[PDB]
Amino acid sequence: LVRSLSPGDIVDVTGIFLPAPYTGFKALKAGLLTETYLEAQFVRQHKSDVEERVMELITSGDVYNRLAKSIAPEIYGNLDVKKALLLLLVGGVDKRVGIRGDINVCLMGDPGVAKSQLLKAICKISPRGVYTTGKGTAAVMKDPVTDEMILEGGALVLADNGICCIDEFDKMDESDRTAIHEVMEQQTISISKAGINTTLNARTSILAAANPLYGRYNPRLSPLDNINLPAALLSRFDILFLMLDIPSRDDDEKLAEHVTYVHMHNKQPDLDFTPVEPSKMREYIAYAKTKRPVMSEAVNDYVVQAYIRLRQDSKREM
């Protein structure tokens, strides 16, 4: 039965509940008060057919517009943010260096907007996904005195082949700033406790949910002035969305209807296709990861003129 249990498990362990005795000297020291342990006997976990099923779903359902609404069915609006979240969930593959196949997006948003709900929805569906806040990553060494274990992990290493949902990204100190900076352009976190210089592989896709300081976002003020993030860190983000709420007359009404229906029926107000299983995304990533779609030469051309005109308009705007 050894190695059948891991810290990230919910199990129904069946065993013989036995009184381990304090045999020795602390024996007379304590007395009749025994210590107990469970001699485990049977562990029951709780936690191409699928390829055909997902292929058929591709034929029937439009993945681009369906999976987006499937990510956050109970969150109204912000569809394009969900579409970008799909790209983060899948992610390109460019392991060859000369680079990286991890997509990172930050949602500057606005207080009162369901950024945290989107982060939790991503965490609960993304394999190897974790959710954390800035104020309570990194790592700690030798937490228990007795056993004296070595190189305990943190929050970024757990989502190694997954996503870290760093809520309250702005409210996160300089030590974690350096840690996430190392993770972002190295995919491997390291420590220097006692000159060991050991490192932990954390190839985690980063999903940040920073919110503006001084409460509500100010559209008049410059975006980097509204959130206390250095331009060096933000500029390295692959895609960035500023998604703030505006008081309207119809969006709020539909939002209220949605939320109240959820409260009545304990279920989403189903009005369109809402796939639930995440195994389709797993099949897609496992399928095209070996494929590694090769870019076309005409693609490279169109993107070089795309960069030329993008830089031109960037100047002409400034």
Partner 1 sequence: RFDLVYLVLDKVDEKNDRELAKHLTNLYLEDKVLPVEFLTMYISYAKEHIHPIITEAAKTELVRAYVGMRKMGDKRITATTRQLESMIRLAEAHAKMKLKNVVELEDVQEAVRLIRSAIKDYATDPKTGKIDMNLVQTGKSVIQRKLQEDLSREIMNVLKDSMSFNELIKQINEHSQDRVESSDIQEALSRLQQEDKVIVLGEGVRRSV
Ligand X SMILES: Nc1ncnc2c1ncn2[C@@H]1O[C@H](COP(=O)(O)OP(=O)(O)OP(O)(O)=S)[C@@H](O)[C@H]1O
Query: Binding site for ATP, residues?
Result: 76, 112, 114-116, 211, 236
Work out how close the CB of 18 gets to Mg ion at its nearest, in angstroms, rounded to a whole number.
47
Query: Does 217 help bind ligand X (rule: CB under 6 A)?
Result: no
Tokens linked to 165? 């949902």
269 binds ligand X (CB under 6 A): no
Choices 3-11, 110-118, 124-132, 176-184; region in contact with Mg ion by CB under 5 A: 110-118
The distance of closest approach from Cβ of residue 89 to partner 1 in the complex, given in angstroms and rounded to an integer, is 23
Q: Which of 86, 114, 122, 163 binds ligand X (CB under 6 A)?
A: 114
Q: Is 276 in the site for partner 1 (CB under 8 A)?
A: no
Give the nearest residue (CB) to Mg ion: 116
Among residues 61, 100, 116, 120, the one that binds Mg ion under rule CB under 5 A = 116
Do residues 217 and 116 touch, judged by C-beta distance below 8 A?
no
Q: Does 111 bind ligand X (CB under 6 A)?
A: yes
**Nearest-angstrom CA–CA distance, 245 and 111:** 8
255 near ligand X, rule: CB under 6 A: yes
Backbone angles phi, psi at 315, to 5 degrees: -65, -50
Separation between Cα atoms, residue 166 and residue 123, nearest integer Å: 10
- Say how many C-beta atoms besides its own lie within 10 A of residue 109's C-beta: 24
- Which does residue 112 touch among Mg ion, partner 1, ligand X, none (CB within 5 to 8 A, set by kind)? ligand X
- The annotation places the binding site at 76, 112, 114-116, 211, 236
Taking the complex as a whole, the smallest distance from the CB of residue 144 to partner 1 amounts, in Å, to: 45
235 binds, among ligand X, partner 1, Mg ion, none (CB under 5 to 8 A by kind): none
Stretch that binds ligand X, among 42-50, 113-121, 182-190, 278-286 (CB under 6 A): 113-121
189 touches 204 (CB < 8 A): no
Least Cβ distance, residue 118 to ligand X (angstroms): 8
Structure-derived torsion over alpha carbons of residues 20, 25, 31, 32, reported in degrees to the nearest 10: 20
Could you give the CA distance from residue 221 to residue 227 in angstroms, rounded to a whole number?
10
* Residue among 259 and 303 whose Cβ is closer to ligand X: 259
Token reading at 51:
């390829």
| Residue 228 or 312 with smaller CB distance to partner 1 | 312
Q: Closest approach of Cβ 296 to partner 1, in Å?
A: 11
- Identify which of 301, 304, 285 has the alpha carbon closest to the alpha carbon of residue 293: 285
| Residue 227 interacts with ligand X (CB under 6 A): yes or no | no
Largest interatomic CA distance in the chain: 86
- Dihedral of alpha carbons 71, 76, 77, 78, sign: negative
Q: Least distance to ligand X from the beta carbon of 74, Å?
A: 6
Beta bridge partners of 152: 140
Angle, helix 115-125 to helix 63-71, in steps of 10 degrees = 110
Does residue 117 bind ligand X (CB under 6 A)?
A: yes
Q: Which residues contact 34 (CB under 8 A, 6 or more apart)?
A: 19, 20, 21, 22
256 binds ligand X (CB under 6 A): no
Q: Where does residue 168 rank: exposed (0-12), middle (13-18), buried (19+ CB within 10 A)?
A: middle
Query: What does DSSP say about strands 11-20 and 199-201: parallel, antiparallel, or unpaired?
Result: unpaired
By the rule CB under 5 A, 133 interacts with Mg ion: no
Query: Which residues contribute to the site for Mg ion (CB under 5 A)?
Result: 116
Residues binding partner 1 (CB under 8 A): 96-98, 292, 294-295, 297, 300, 303-304, 307-308, 311-312, 314-315
Binding site for ligand X (CB under 6 A): 74-77, 109, 111-117, 211, 255, 259
